[PDB]
C-alpha cells in the first residue's frame, strides 16, 4: 500500500524517479511556459508519473493482448465498406460539424473510387477493469493519434530501475512488470510502410499541432524511425502542409520538395485544429494522395464512438469477421452499448441513470444523466465502476498521494498490402492513473 | 566552415540537436530558475553545445592522449612526499587563508601517519593548442571535481548523430569524432576502488554543492554506478556530512546510518563552499576517515597551480620519476611558469606584457599584467590559440560566433599497497568559447 510508505523513503524514491526521467527523456514541455510546445530543449520537466506502477491482474492484462489483433482486423474491414460508415454516421453529421466534414472527404474518396492499397494502423484500445464484475471491458478504441508509445516504454523502465534499487525497502519482483517496446514496434511498423511504398528517396511525414508540450513522445518515434530503419522524417502543420504541399500527376504527395511515403497524424482529430479552410485542403490534399495514411478518412472515422456503438448491435460483427470465436472474444469485453435513438434504453437511463455514461460522440454521470435525458426531450453507455487505489503522483517534482482509477491501453500495429497482412499484433500498452489530473503508470502483474 | 552554413540548414541541425539533448539526458537546470538548482526533473534545458564539432588535429590528440598516464603517477608520487608539498605552498598559505587550511589539514593527517593505502585520481589535464608554434601546451591540471565526464560522452554521440544525418547536406567523416567513455571509465574506476575497500554493504558518497546546475552530469556517473557495478551512491553537502557523519574506533565513515567506501569531491574546491566552522570539522572527519578519498588532501594540493608551477623547475621532474622519455614528454607540455618571486621573469612580464597571463592560485590578461604586477598568484607564457568559426546553442537559440577551444583528457588512476591496479587515459573534453562557453567534441584532421 504506498499511503502506509514512509515520507523519508517517499522522498528518496521521488528524487531517484526525477533523475531517471531527467536523463532518459521521460519529459514533457512545463505548462507555464510560452516557448516549451514550440522550441525543443527548453523549459522541460519531467513526465508526470505514478511513483509506484499500478497492481492489475495478468488474466485480464492476457485478455485485453489478446484481443489486439481481432480489433485491428475489425477496423480494416469495417474502414473498407464505405456505405456501412456514411449510413452509420448520417444522424451525426447533421449535428456536428466536424464529423460532417470528414464525412464530405470520405464522399470525395468514394466519388473518384479511390483505393488504398498500404494501409497502415496505429491503434490504442483503452479498457477499465469493473471492481465488482472483475470485467475487462472497452471504454474506446483510438484509430487516430495514438498518444504515448515513446513515453509508456520509457514508464515501465522507470519502475523496473526503482523497484531494482529498492529491494531492500520494498518487497516486490520487478519481473512482474511486462516488457514494453511500443515506441520501436511502432517505428517498425512505419518503417515497413514506408518500405511497402518503394521509394528510397521518400520521407514520413508527421502531421502535428503548432503548439506541443507532449513533443518529445512523438520525437522519440522519428528517433527510432531515423537511428534503426534510416527512415527520415518531417514535422508539419495543417497550414504548412497547405502552403507547401502539391500533388504530381502521378499523386505523390511532395511537401517542401521531398515525396511523402507516409502520412503519421498527431493533429487533425479535433475541430480546433482546423483554424481556417487551409487546413480542410491540406486534408482533403494528402487524402487523394498515393501516400498511406495513417489514419486513412475511412480509419479516422471507424474510430468513432458511433461506430462502436454500431458495431455492439445484433448481427454486426457477423458482417466483418467469419470468425465465431474472434467475434466472442470481442463481446466479452463490450459493455453494453446504445444510441439516444433505442428509446427503451432512454427511458431505463431516465429510471435508473446512475447505471449509465452519457458520452458525446464532456461526459455526463450519474443524477445528471437523468436531467439531460429529460432536457433534450451523443451515445449511452453501461457506467463502468473501476478500484479506487492508493497511489503517488509525481507532477512538477512534487509527490502527492491520491486516491486513483486507472486505465489500460493497448497499442496495435496493423499493416496490409493489396493481398497480404505484414503485421498484425498487439505491440505494448499504457497505464494512466488519474485523481477520482492524470499522470503515466505501467502495470504490476498479479 | 560553419559560418558559410546556409541559415535554414542551421535551423534544422539546431532542431536536431535540441531533440536529441532532450532524449538522451545531455541537460543542465535553467539558469533562471530558483529549483533547477535543487530539485531534479525540473526547469531543465540542453546544456549548452556547439552546433559542428571542432577541427583538431591527430597528432596533438595522440600526444595528449599519451601522457595521460604519466601525469596519473606524477601526480600519486608528488602527493607522497608530503614535506615536498607543505615546502611548496609555504609562501601561499600566509596570503590564501583558503589553501592554508587545506594545509593544515594535511599537516593534522602527518601528525598521526595517516596512511592512503587505496589511493583514485579522477583528473582532468587541460590544454590549448598555439597557433603559431603548433605546440599542444598545458593550462592546468585538475585533481578535484572534473566536471563533464557524464556530457561529454554525450556530445560526442550528438555530433557523430548530427553528422551521420546530414551526410547528404555536411561533407564530413564521422569516424573522425574519437570514441569517448569518460563517464563510465570513470564509474568503473570508482567502483574498483569500492571493491578494493572491500564491504559490499559500502556506499560510495559524492560531496556535492547546495545549489547544483550541473546535476544531471553527476547522475550520469551515479547512474553508471547503479546499473552497470551495484554499487549504491549517496548524494550530501559538507554541511549535511558534519550533521550526519561520525567515526567508528577502526577510522570507518558512517553517514546516515550507511558505511562510505570511496568520498567523490564534486564541492570543498573553493572557499565559497565552506559557509562556517560545520564545512570544515566535516573535511577533517572524512580525511581522517579509512575511505577512499578522491581527492584526498594530498591529491588536492597536488593539482594546485603552484605545484604545476615547482614542478616545470630544473631537477624537479627528476625527483619523481626514473624514465627519462616519460619526463621528456611531460616537458614538451610545459608552457613557460613562474612565480612572483622570480623577479627577472617580473621585470620582463613589466616589459612585455602581451606574452604573460597572470593567475592565481581571476585571469589578468596583455596590458593588465603590467598594471597589475605594478600595484603589488603565478605568471604564465600567455597560448594565443587559432580563432575559429563556430555554432553555438544557448537556451534554444544559435549564435554563429568567432572562438577558442580548450582540450581536455580525463584520466583514471587506482592503486592499493603493492599494485597499480588502474592508470589510463579515460576520454576526453572539448570546451569551446566566445573570444561564454559551450561543450564540443573534436573532428580530428
Ligand atoms: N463506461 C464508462 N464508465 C465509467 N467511466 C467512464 C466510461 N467511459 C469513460 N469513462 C471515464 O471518462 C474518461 C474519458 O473517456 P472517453 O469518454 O472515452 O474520452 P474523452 O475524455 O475524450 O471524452 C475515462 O478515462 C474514464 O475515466
Ligand atoms: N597560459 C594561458 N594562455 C592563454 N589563455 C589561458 C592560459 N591559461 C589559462 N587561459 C585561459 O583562461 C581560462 C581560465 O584559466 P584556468 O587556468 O583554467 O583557471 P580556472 O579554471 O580557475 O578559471 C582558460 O579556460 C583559458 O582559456
Ligand atoms: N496532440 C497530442 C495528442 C493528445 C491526445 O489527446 N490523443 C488522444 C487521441 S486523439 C489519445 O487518446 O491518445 C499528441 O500528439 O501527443
Ligand atoms: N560544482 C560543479 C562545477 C565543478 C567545476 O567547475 N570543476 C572544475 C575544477 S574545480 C573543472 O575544471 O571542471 C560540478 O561539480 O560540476
Ligand atoms: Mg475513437
Ligand atoms: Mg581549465
Ligand atoms: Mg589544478
Redesign the pocket.
Known amino acids: 500500500d504506498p499511503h502506509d510508505i514512509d515520507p523519508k523513503l517517499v522522498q528518496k524514491l521521488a528524487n531517484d524517479a526525477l533523475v531517471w526521467c531527467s536523463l532518459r527523456g521521460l519529459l514533457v514541455g512545463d505548462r507555464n511556459s510560452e516557448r516549451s510546445g514550440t522550441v525543443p530543449g527548453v523549459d522541460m520537466v519531467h513526465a508526470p508519473v505514478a511513483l509506484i506502477p499500478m497492481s492489475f491482474p495478468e488474466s485480464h492484462w492476457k485478455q485485453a493482448c489478446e484481443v489486439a489483433p481481432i480489433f485491428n482486423e475489425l477496423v480494416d474491414r469495417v474502414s473498407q465498406d464505405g456505405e456501412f460508415l456514411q449510413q452509420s454516421l448520417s444522424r451525426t453529421r447533421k449535428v456536428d460539424p466536424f464529423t460532417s466534414r470528414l464525412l464530405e472527404i470520405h464522399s470525395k474518396m468514394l466519388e473518384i473510387n479511390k483505393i488504398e492499397e498500404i494501409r497502415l494502423g496505429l491503434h490504442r484500445s483503452?479498457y477499465?477493469l469493473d471492481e465488482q464484475t472483475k470485467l475487462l471491458l472497452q471504454?474506446?478504441l483510438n484509430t487516430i493519434s495514438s498518444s504515448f508509445p515513446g513515453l509508456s516504454c520509457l514508464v515501465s523502465e522507470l519502475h523496473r530501475s526503482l523497484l531494482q534499487q529498492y529491494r531492500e525497502d520494498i518487497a516486490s519482483d520487478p519481473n512482474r512488470i511486462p516488457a514494453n517496446n511500443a515506441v520501436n514496434q511502432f517505428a517498425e511498423a512505419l518503417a515497413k510502410a514506408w518500405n511497402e511504398y518503394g521509394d528510397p528517396r521518400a520521407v514520413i511525414m508527421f502531421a502535428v499541432q503548432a503548439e506541443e508540450r507532449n513533443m518529445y513522445d512523438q520525437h522519440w518515434l522519428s528517433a527510432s524511425l531515423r537511428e534503426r530503419h534510416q527512415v527520415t522524417t518531417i514535422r508539419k502543420t495543417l497550414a504548412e502542409i497547405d502552403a507547401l504541399g502539391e500533388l504530381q500527376q502521378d499523386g505523390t504527395l511532395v511537401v517542401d520538395g521531398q515525396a511523402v511515403a507516409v502520412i503519421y497524424f498527431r493533429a487533425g482529430y479535433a475541430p480546433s485544429d482546423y483554424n481556417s479552410e487551409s487546413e480542410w485542403k491540406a486534408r482533403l490534399l494528402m487524402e487523394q494522395s498515393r501516400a498511406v495514411k495513417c489514419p486513412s478518412i475511412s480509419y479516422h472515422l471507424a474510430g468513432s464512438k458511433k461506430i462502436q456503438q454500431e458495431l455492439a448491435k445484433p448481427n454486426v460483427l457477423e458482417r466483418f469477421l467469419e470468425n465465431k470465436d474472434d467475434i466472442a472474444k470481442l463481446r466479452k469485453c463490450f459493455?453494453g452499448l446504445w444510441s439516444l435513438d433505442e428509446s427503451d434504453i432512454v427511458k431505463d437511463a431516465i429510471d435508473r441513470p446512475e447505471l449509465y455514461?452519457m458520452?458525446?460522440q464532456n461526459?455526463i454521470y450519474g443524477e445528471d444523466v437523468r436531467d439531460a435525458l429529460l432536457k433534450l426531450q451523443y451515445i449511452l453507455?453501461?457506467?463502468?465502476f473501476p478500484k479506487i487505489s492508493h497511489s503517488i503522483l509525481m507532477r512538477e517534482g512534487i509527490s502527492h498521494k491520491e486516491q486513483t482509477?486507472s486505465?489500460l491501453g493497448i497499442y496495435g500495429t496493423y499493416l496490409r498490402n493489396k493481398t497480404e497482412v505484414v503485421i498484425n499484433q498487439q505491440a505494448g500498452y499504457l497505464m494512466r492513473t488519474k485523481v477520482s489530473f492524470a499522470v503515466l503508470d505501467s502495470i504490476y502483474l498479479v
Open positions: 483503452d477499465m471504454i474506446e459493455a455514461v458520452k458525446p461526459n453507455m453501461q457506467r463502468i482509477i486505465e
